[PDB]
Amino acid sequence: QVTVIPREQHAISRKDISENALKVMYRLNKAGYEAWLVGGGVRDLLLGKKPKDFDVTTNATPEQVRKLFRNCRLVGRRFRLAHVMFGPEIIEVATFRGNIFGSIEEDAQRRDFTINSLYYSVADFTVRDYVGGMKDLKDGVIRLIGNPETRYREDPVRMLRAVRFAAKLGMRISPETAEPIPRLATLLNDIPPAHLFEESLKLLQAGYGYETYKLLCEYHLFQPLFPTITRYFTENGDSPMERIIEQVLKNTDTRIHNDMRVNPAFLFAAMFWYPLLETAQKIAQESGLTYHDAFALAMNDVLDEACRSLAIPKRLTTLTRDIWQLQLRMSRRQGKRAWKLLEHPKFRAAYDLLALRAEVERNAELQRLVKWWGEFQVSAPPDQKGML
């Protein structure tokens, strides 16, 4: 058991890679308080990689953190936890917890996993490890902190997080941490769908999506979130839907690493596609009506019951409705309206779906439509005219 690591034993964590929340700590340190660097950032630093956040903690009460910074720009609210602003770097300043506000050792125990629970002191260049930490981090192990059994019951979402970190760093989940998930997964249904929607994005949409879906599938965590989707999985292994989902995820992933921006309205529009299509089949051959009005129904429903687990915001659903709408429109080869279409704000997305639709089905009459719209959109107006 090693509770304090000296800077000369702990990987660089060189004071010079800490941007300047340094100013935020030195200020506290000057005032008879303690300033520690917790969680995400301090993990990464030890890891070698570049911190994306810098969060700090202190034995200073939240009203004591208030006075010391009444002159600075403090962004809003939140019990405990204060928000400091430079600009394109905001710094989180949280008071230790335990009756309510306690010690560093106390605070370490209410933190979900090991590595995300290392602490750094500018004041002593030491990192504090009241937990597995340093070893877990070295061995590459996502270990939970209290008794898995009970923690997952208090906050089930911890279970999702477990996988998420599992995929983003190349690490494995501790056996005792792993055992309970498949049994307890269903517990995510007692979760406010909104909260789930956030974690759906943190999982797929943060550029690890593919590896995180593999892990979400291997622990039956995928199913409580996307029941409309699980249902159309197949024994064989790789139907058209099961291919698209992999692909859109690998791509959504590639875009993030090349630093593109990305549409979440898209990722859903892709994944629920084939289900929408299936529901269009049954809706038409049964209860016989036109394919158009049928399809329209399939949307409301697919989206209704999906929106029953994740709470997709009215905004995204409505763009999705459009990316699907375009799928039909683009299908019928025709003229004049084409300009009207190319103009559509969600066109770029709609094209990228048709892209997938044709890659996965390997249906060459789509890949046909795909070359046509490919050329119609990079082509200049005299030739655009000639294509109709």
Partner from Mg ion, a second copy, none binding residue 118, C-beta < 5-8 Å depending on class: none
Partner from Mg ion, a second copy, none binding residue 260, C-beta < 5-8 Å depending on class: a second copy
Return residues touching Mg ion (CB under 5 A): 53
In this structure, are strands 82-87 and 89-95 parallel, antiparallel, or unpaired? antiparallel
Residue 235, judged by CB atoms within 10 A of its CB (0-12, 13-18, 19+), counts as: exposed
Q: Which residue out of 112, 136, 253, 322 is catalytically annotated? A: 112
The distance of closest approach from Cβ of residue 359 to Mg ion in the complex, given in angstroms and rounded to an integer, is: 37
Neighbours of 216 (CB within 10 A): 25
Partner from Mg ion, a second copy, none binding residue 332, C-beta < 5-8 Å depending on class: none
Alpha-carbon distance of 268 to 376, in angstroms, equals 26
Q: Is 55 a catalytic residue?
A: yes
Residue 164, judged by CB atoms within 10 A of its CB (0-12, 13-18, 19+), counts as: buried
Q: Is 253 a catalytic residue?
A: no
Nearer to a second copy, 29 or 377 (CB): 377
Alpha-carbon distance of 160 to 151, in angstroms, equals 13
Q: Is 53 a catalytic residue?
A: yes
Angle CA(137)–CA(139)–CA(140) in degrees, nearest 5? 60
Phi, psi (5° rounding) for residue 191? -100, 140
Partner from a second copy, Mg ion, none binding residue 251, C-beta < 5-8 Å depending on class: a second copy
In this chain, which residue has its C-beta nearest to Mg ion?
53
Nearer to a second copy, 29 or 384 (CB): 384
Contact 252, 267 (CB under 8 A): yes
The distance of closest approach from Cβ of residue 40 to Mg ion in the complex, given in angstroms and rounded to an integer, is: 6
Return residues touching a second copy (CB under 8 A): 250-251, 254-255, 258-261, 336, 339-340, 342-343, 351-352, 355-356, 359, 373-375, 377-382, 385
Q: Which residue out of 44, 55, 129, 253 is catalytically annotated? A: 55
Q: Which residues are catalytic?
A: 53, 55, 112
